[PDB]
Amino acid sequence: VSKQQYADANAAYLQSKAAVEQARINLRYTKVLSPISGRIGRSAVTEGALVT
Amino acid sequence: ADGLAARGTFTEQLQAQRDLVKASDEYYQLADKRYRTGVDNYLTLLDAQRSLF
């Protein structure tokens, strides 16, 4: 297999790996990680609210 | 007269034949440059070597 075919194959490999990394951060946003450490207050919403 | 006819035509026949092998060798060297650069693979160069042969 020629060198240009492999250099085009691994480029699409890295592009799909970047697409999976783009999906993983949207999947990590659904579990709302605490941005800092501290004291958390009263939850302004409860279970069942629609957020945006 | 048969020998004279063949002597009359085989000169241009072999001239047109040696030009064919020269053009096929030029095709083989261009395909070898494409293989050395990295555009074509080792399966395409062998298909030009057979045309040389």
From TrEMBL, chain A:
Location of this chain's protein in the cell: Cell inner membrane
Family label: Belongs to the membrane fusion protein (MFP) (TC 8.A.1) family.
Annotated protein name in UniProt: MexA family multidrug efflux RND transporter periplasmic adaptor subunit
Species for this entry: Pseudomonas aeruginosa
